[PDB]
Amino acid sequence: TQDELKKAVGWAALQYVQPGTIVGVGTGSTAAHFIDALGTMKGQIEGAVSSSDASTEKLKSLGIHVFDLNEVDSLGIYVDGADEINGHMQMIKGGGAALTREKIIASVAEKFICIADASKQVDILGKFPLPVEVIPMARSAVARQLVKLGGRPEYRQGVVTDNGNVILDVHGMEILDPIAMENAINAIPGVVTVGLFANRGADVALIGTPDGVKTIVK
Amino acid sequence: TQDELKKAVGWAALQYVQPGTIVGVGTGSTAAHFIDALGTMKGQIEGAVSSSDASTEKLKSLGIHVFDLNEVDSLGIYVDGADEINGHMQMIKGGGAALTREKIIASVAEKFICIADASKQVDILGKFPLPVEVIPMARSAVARQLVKLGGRPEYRQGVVTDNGNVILDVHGMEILDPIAMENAINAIPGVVTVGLFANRGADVALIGTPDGVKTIVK
């Protein structure tokens, strides 16, 4: 979409920010717009928890205190995009650089507000390769199991996670039952995090469109 | 002595080691005895895959070549101890903080041979605190979820795993359904490995007792 649609979406997410809470902040162009909006509410929030250095720097530029996750016991909401989101509000995330950090922050938030572009909406998750963070020594073992689960794992060359792990992007899966798939992959020894946000998906989806921001509630 | 019982099972495991094979090797005081035993077969085996630097160092000193797990596509057997093993041959492991490498190698091995003295046998897993390896930034979040699952997580002070993570030892659980609990903990964002070997338990258990080594088959 255009920057204007993203801006509208980012600012629309501000309506989910409850005074006196700590806000979970995602990353990306739309998230950046939400941060600008959050700056106007710096007086009603205690602070924020950020999913990236980029977002952390911007939050600080607006005078918002950024907490380490271990310092908080709860987040009102977590506002972030996704690589894919289906009709059941389940998502695929992690195509970028911080899969694990994002899933952890999302687990602490009461509500996940997805601000992914309209192009991210799909019926069956899987077209976009599913990211799986893996302990380096277990790469081949996990890959073999991912093949048995019906996917084509591809080592993301030249990339390491902040946890020092590698990523296997799984291609060709038609994920009909995201929860069962998330559980199946989380069960593999060597897997740190899988990019399926299914057991804990989005609670609200704000989709930008030519006729305004569309709100989809779980 | 209890050590003699450990020695008995460590050497009894050699019965399962065939010439020209690559052996999966565990860690701990009981596995140490199996390593001594393996030394007597150094010139007859192809090598081994180790679950810890301590075990690797001992294997190398005995003239046994150590392969990285990514160098093999399968393993015939994996011999290791356990902190607890129940009647269904499910185990609690990780008291020594090497649970991640142990669980990964065990996922590749066809046959898991648990070697332990009689004191490791229990009816209900849980008396021995359940180790849970967690991404540092997720410590508090994971601890809160472990409390919700009925446990009392205790941060293992001053210890870090080979993967740079921390450990939460969970006390007070009477784990009636190890598979359900293993799945529940593996579902928590931030968890790297949980010390429950339930979906994949032992195939053979060699128990050292005053009346000799007892062999339990799955």
Swiss-Prot record, chains A, B:
- An example Gene Ontology biological process: pentose-phosphate shunt, non-oxidative branch
Keyword Isomerase in the entry? The reply is yes
Which amino acids does the record list as binding substrate? Answer: 27-30, 80-83, 93-96, 120
Which pathway does the record list? Carbohydrate degradation; pentose phosphate pathway; D-ribose 5-phosphate from D-ribulose 5-phosphate (non-oxidative stage): step 1/1
For the protein in the UniProt heading, the enzyme class is isomerase
Q: Which UniProt keywords apply?
A: Isomerase
Keyword Isomerase on entry = yes
> Mind telling me which GO cellular component terms the entry cites?
cytosol
What do we know about what induces or represses this protein's expression?
Answer: Constitutively expressed.
Tell me one Pfam family matched here.
Rib_5-P_isom_A
The record's Gene3D superfamilies line, in alphabetical order, gives: 3.30.70.260, 3.40.50.1360
Reactions it catalyzes? aldehydo-D-ribose 5-phosphate = D-ribulose 5-phosphate
Q: What is the effect of changing residue 83 to A?
A: Activity decreases by 250-fold, with little change on affinity binding
Give the InterPro entries listed for this entry. NagB/RpiA_transferase-like, Ribose5P_isomerase_typA_subgr, Ribose5P_isomerase_type_A
**Regulation of its function:** Inhibited by arabinose-5-phosphate, D-erythrose-4-phosphate and D-erythronic acid.
CDD domains xrefs: RPI_A
Give the EC number(s) listed in the UniProt record: 5.3.1.6
Catalytic residues of the enzyme: 102
> How is the quaternary structure described?
Homodimer.
Name by which UniProt lists this protein: Ribose-5-phosphate isomerase A
